[PDB]
Design an enzyme around this catalytic site. Structure first.
Site, PDB file in Angstrom:
ATOM      1  N   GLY A  89       2.938   6.562   8.722  1.00 48.42           N
ATOM      2  CA  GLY A  89       4.207   6.658   8.024  1.00 48.42           C
ATOM      3  C   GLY A  89       5.267   5.684   8.522  1.00 48.42           C
ATOM      4  O   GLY A  89       6.420   5.759   8.095  1.00 48.42           O
ATOM      5  N   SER A 125       4.627   2.175   8.579  1.00 46.83           N
ATOM      6  CA  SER A 125       4.441   0.878   7.943  1.00 46.83           C
ATOM      7  C   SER A 125       5.701   0.504   7.175  1.00 46.83           C
ATOM      8  O   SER A 125       6.373   1.364   6.601  1.00 46.83           O
ATOM      9  CB  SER A 125       3.238   0.884   7.002  1.00 46.83           C
ATOM     10  OG  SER A 125       3.465   1.731   5.893  1.00 46.83           O
ATOM     11  N   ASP A 137       0.024  -7.589   1.670  1.00 47.20           N
ATOM     12  CA  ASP A 137       0.425  -6.185   1.686  1.00 47.20           C
ATOM     13  C   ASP A 137       1.941  -6.088   1.794  1.00 47.20           C
ATOM     14  O   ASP A 137       2.479  -5.313   2.592  1.00 47.20           O
ATOM     15  CB  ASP A 137      -0.255  -5.436   2.837  1.00 47.20           C
ATOM     16  CG  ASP A 137      -0.137  -3.924   2.704  1.00 47.20           C
ATOM     17  OD1 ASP A 137       0.207  -3.445   1.605  1.00 47.20           O
ATOM     18  OD2 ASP A 137      -0.393  -3.209   3.701  1.00 47.20           O
ATOM     19  N   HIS A 160       0.829  -1.208   0.000  1.00 47.29           N
ATOM     20  CA  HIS A 160       0.000   0.000   0.000  1.00 47.29           C
ATOM     21  C   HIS A 160       0.866   1.263   0.000  1.00 47.29           C
ATOM     22  O   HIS A 160       0.381   2.362  -0.256  1.00 47.29           O
ATOM     23  CB  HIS A 160      -1.032  -0.001   1.145  1.00 47.29           C
ATOM     24  CG  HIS A 160      -0.469   0.333   2.492  1.00 47.29           C
ATOM     25  ND1 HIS A 160      -0.148  -0.630   3.426  1.00 47.29           N
ATOM     26  CD2 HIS A 160      -0.203   1.523   3.078  1.00 47.29           C
ATOM     27  CE1 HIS A 160       0.309  -0.048   4.518  1.00 47.29           C
ATOM     28  NE2 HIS A 160       0.288   1.259   4.335  1.00 47.29           N
TER      29      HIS A 160
HETATM   30  C1  LIG Z   1      -4.239  -5.161   6.127  1.00 39.66           C
HETATM   31  C2  LIG Z   1      -3.997  -3.760   5.799  1.00 39.66           C
HETATM   32  C3  LIG Z   1      -3.929  -3.365   4.362  1.00 39.66           C
HETATM   33  N1  LIG Z   1      -3.552  -4.228   3.457  1.00 39.66           N
HETATM   34  C4  LIG Z   1      -3.503  -3.837   2.186  1.00 39.66           C
HETATM   35  C5  LIG Z   1      -3.103  -4.743   1.189  1.00 39.66           C
HETATM   36  C6  LIG Z   1      -3.035  -4.313  -0.125  1.00 39.66           C
HETATM   37  C7  LIG Z   1      -3.354  -3.000  -0.454  1.00 39.66           C
HETATM   38  O1  LIG Z   1      -3.281  -2.640  -1.786  1.00 39.66           O
HETATM   39  C8  LIG Z   1      -3.472  -1.323  -2.155  1.00 39.66           C
HETATM   40  C9  LIG Z   1      -3.751  -2.119   0.558  1.00 39.66           C
HETATM   41  C10 LIG Z   1      -3.807  -2.551   1.890  1.00 39.66           C
HETATM   42  N2  LIG Z   1      -4.184  -1.658   2.845  1.00 39.66           N
HETATM   43  C11 LIG Z   1      -4.232  -2.061   4.073  1.00 39.66           C
HETATM   44  O2  LIG Z   1      -4.641  -1.247   5.091  1.00 39.66           O
HETATM   45  C12 LIG Z   1      -4.442   0.128   4.903  1.00 39.66           C
HETATM   46  C13 LIG Z   1      -3.193   0.467   4.899  1.00 39.66           C
HETATM   47  C14 LIG Z   1      -2.772   0.846   6.350  1.00 39.66           C
HETATM   48  C15 LIG Z   1      -1.978   1.912   7.192  1.00 39.66           C
HETATM   49  O3  LIG Z   1      -2.318   3.039   7.361  1.00 39.66           O
HETATM   50  N3  LIG Z   1      -0.791   1.492   7.821  1.00 39.66           N
HETATM   51  C16 LIG Z   1       0.088   2.244   8.678  1.00 39.66           C
HETATM   52  C17 LIG Z   1       0.963   3.324   7.947  1.00 39.66           C
HETATM   53  O4  LIG Z   1       1.687   3.975   8.544  1.00 39.66           O
HETATM   54  N4  LIG Z   1       0.914   3.577   6.560  1.00 39.66           N
HETATM   55  S1  LIG Z   1       1.711   4.644   5.759  1.00 39.66           S
HETATM   56  O5  LIG Z   1       1.334   5.833   6.160  1.00 39.66           O
HETATM   57  O6  LIG Z   1       2.981   4.610   6.042  1.00 39.66           O
HETATM   58  C18 LIG Z   1       1.332   4.653   3.996  1.00 39.66           C
HETATM   59  C19 LIG Z   1       2.322   3.791   3.262  1.00 39.66           C
HETATM   60  C20 LIG Z   1       2.452   5.255   3.212  1.00 39.66           C
HETATM   61  C21 LIG Z   1       0.445   1.216   9.728  1.00 39.66           C
HETATM   62  C22 LIG Z   1       0.162   2.573  10.219  1.00 39.66           C
HETATM   63  C23 LIG Z   1      -1.222   3.078  10.351  1.00 39.66           C
HETATM   64  C24 LIG Z   1      -1.445   4.376  10.745  1.00 39.66           C
HETATM   65  C25 LIG Z   1      -2.896   4.813  10.970  1.00 39.66           C
HETATM   66  C26 LIG Z   1      -3.614   4.878   9.669  1.00 39.66           C
HETATM   67  C27 LIG Z   1      -5.092   4.665   9.809  1.00 39.66           C
HETATM   68  C28 LIG Z   1      -5.659   3.528   8.995  1.00 39.66           C
HETATM   69  C29 LIG Z   1      -6.035   2.282   9.818  1.00 39.66           C
HETATM   70  C30 LIG Z   1      -5.771   0.957   9.089  1.00 39.66           C
HETATM   71  N5  LIG Z   1      -6.158  -0.088   9.891  1.00 39.66           N
HETATM   72  C31 LIG Z   1      -6.733  -1.228   9.367  1.00 39.66           C
HETATM   73  O7  LIG Z   1      -6.649  -1.438   8.218  1.00 39.66           O
HETATM   74  O8  LIG Z   1      -6.659  -2.201  10.338  1.00 39.66           O
HETATM   75  C32 LIG Z   1      -7.224  -3.480  10.231  1.00 39.66           C
HETATM   76  C33 LIG Z   1      -6.316  -4.341   9.373  1.00 39.66           C
HETATM   77  C34 LIG Z   1      -7.299  -4.077  11.623  1.00 39.66           C
HETATM   78  C35 LIG Z   1      -8.612  -3.434   9.644  1.00 39.66           C
HETATM   79  C36 LIG Z   1      -4.362   0.848   8.515  1.00 39.66           C
HETATM   80  O9  LIG Z   1      -3.481   0.834   9.237  1.00 39.66           O
HETATM   81  N6  LIG Z   1      -4.141   0.805   7.096  1.00 39.66           N
HETATM   82  C37 LIG Z   1      -5.057   0.854   6.175  1.00 39.66           C
END
Ligand SMILES: CCc1nc2ccc(OC)cc2nc1O[C@@H]1C[C@H]2C(=O)N[C@]3(C(=O)NS(=O)(=O)C4CC4)C[C@@H]3/C=C/CCCCC[C@H](NC(=O)OC(C)(C)C)C(=O)N2C1
Ligand SMILES: [Zn+2]
Length: 197
Positions: free
Chosen positions: A155, A157, A99, A75
């Site tokens: 940010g 992940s 993911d 993602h």
């Molecule tokens: C199985 C997950 C998945 N898996 C994915 C697999 C494939 C895909 O293809 C596009 C997308 C996916 N997105 C997916 O989920 C998306 C992506 C991700 C996400 O947000 N991940 C984080 C992160 O920091 N990301 S990042 O900013 O650095 C971005 C990369 C630049 C970790 C930290 C989160 C901070 C709070 C963000 C609020 C959102 C709550 C959400 N929670 C939620 O989903 O929790 C559960 C699982 C319990 C329901 C969640 O965490 N996420 C939503």
């Protein structure tokens, strides 16, 4: 067709230093150089350490070296190449169901060893070089000893979960949140990486 754009490469723009007594973030490239490196896929900067801070044109997140592979989240990276000194490097692993993506680990990077401790006292490393205690609650879940607003984890992940001995236990994937407060984290177990390989 002739005017169709190509997405740029993922770019290493810094790292989380874990080498000493103090963990801290270092930036190794600014936003201009990053945008340009994304387009060319040519990054001649020296890489060090296990945990890289990476960016696209639009997002910034983390990437972790484990067993000679630099791992991050789909993602974040999508199917993008990563910038290297010899041009864009194609993903060696891609799994949208987990993911998860991975490229060959850059020269100069150091890799973490997969955990075999069987231990549930873990530590999450964030993009701000915070080391957050996490108690393992399942195969892919851990609880924060001290809950944080999701802002604090955003940010991070692609970042590692570590055991007390510094082995990689997992890759940070998603925050389990209620009313904006993260009480637990979802991570890709290192075994799932080992199997993907
Ligand atoms: C199985 C997950 C998945 N898996 C994915 C697999 C494939 C895909 O293809 C596009 C997308 C996916 N997105 C997916 O989920 C998306 C992506 C991700 C996400 O947000 N991940 C984080 C992160 O920091 N990301 S990042 O900013 O650095 C971005 C990369 C630049 C970790 C930290 C989160 C901070 C709070 C963000 C609020 C959102 C709550 C959400 N929670 C939620 O989903 O929790 C559960 C699982 C319990 C329901 C969640 O965490 N996420 C939503
Ligand atoms: Zn261990």
């Amino acid at each position: 067709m002739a005017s169709m754009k190509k997405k740029g490469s993922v770019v290493i723009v810094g790292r989380i230093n874990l080498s000493g007594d103090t963990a801290y973030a270092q930036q190794t490239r600014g936003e201009e150089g990053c945008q340009e490196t994304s387009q060319t896929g040519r990054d001649k900067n020296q890489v060090e350490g296990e945990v890289q801070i990476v960016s696209t044109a639009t997002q910034t997140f983390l990437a972790t070296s484990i067993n000679g592979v630099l791992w991050t989240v789909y993602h974040g990276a999508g199917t993008r190449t990563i910038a290297s000194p010899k041009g864009p490097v194609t993903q060696m692993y891609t799994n949208v169901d987990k993911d998860l993506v991975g490229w060959q680990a850059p020269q100069g990077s150091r890799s973490l060893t997969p955990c075999t401790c069987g231990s549930s006292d873990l530590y999450l490393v964030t993009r701000h070089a915070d080391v957050i205690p996490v108690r393992r609650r399942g195969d892919s879940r851990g609880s924060l000893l001290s809950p944080r607003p999701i802002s604090y984890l955003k940010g991070s992940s692609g970042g590692p979960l570590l055991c007390p001995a510094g082995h990689a236990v997992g890759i940070f994937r998603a925050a389990v949140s209620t009313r904006g407060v993260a009480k637990a984290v979802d991570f890709i177990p290192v075994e799932s990486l080992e199997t993907t390989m």
